[PDB]
Nucleic acid binder design. Sequence first.
DNA 1: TCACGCAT
DNA 2: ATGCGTGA
Lengths: 85, 87
Amino acid sequence: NIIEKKYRSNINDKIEQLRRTVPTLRVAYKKCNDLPITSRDLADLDGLEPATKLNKASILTKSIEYICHLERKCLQLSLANQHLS
Amino acid sequence: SHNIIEKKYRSNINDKIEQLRRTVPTLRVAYKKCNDLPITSRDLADLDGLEPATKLNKASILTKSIEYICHLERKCLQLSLANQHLS
DNA sequence: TCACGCAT
DNA sequence: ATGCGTGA
């Protein structure tokens, strides 16, 4: 079934977008592909430990990690902006 | 067995996709409507202008999660630029 | 680990 | 759309 291939492809395509969006996944992809790790890349981590394996589960796990981190960051920042920290 | 370890492989992925549905606000509100749950004022605000998801399949959970990541990333710059008095 | 065909 | 089987 070609249709069934579209369902797998569309899920995989969104998996790759998370890899190219989450900093802990962008850094890992650079190592195995022999790409330059810059201080910009190290700055995007914001202290988060870079991912070692690049499977689907790790991509999802890191995406969950990045979402909660960004949330806490926004919260603390807004607490400073509204003079609440 | 190979079927058993493959079952734990498939279950492990689905456990994390369900976890995203329990974290992204556009999916939490969508889950409340499909399960006939009271959508409060705080639920609507968490969306921060993002539209709730219509379908709740795996692909929908992923695409709304990517949307939520970009929203929080944009809201950190703005919030930060102001904190540093740059704006 | 992932893709795939199938029964659901 | 998706869990399962299975070959890879």
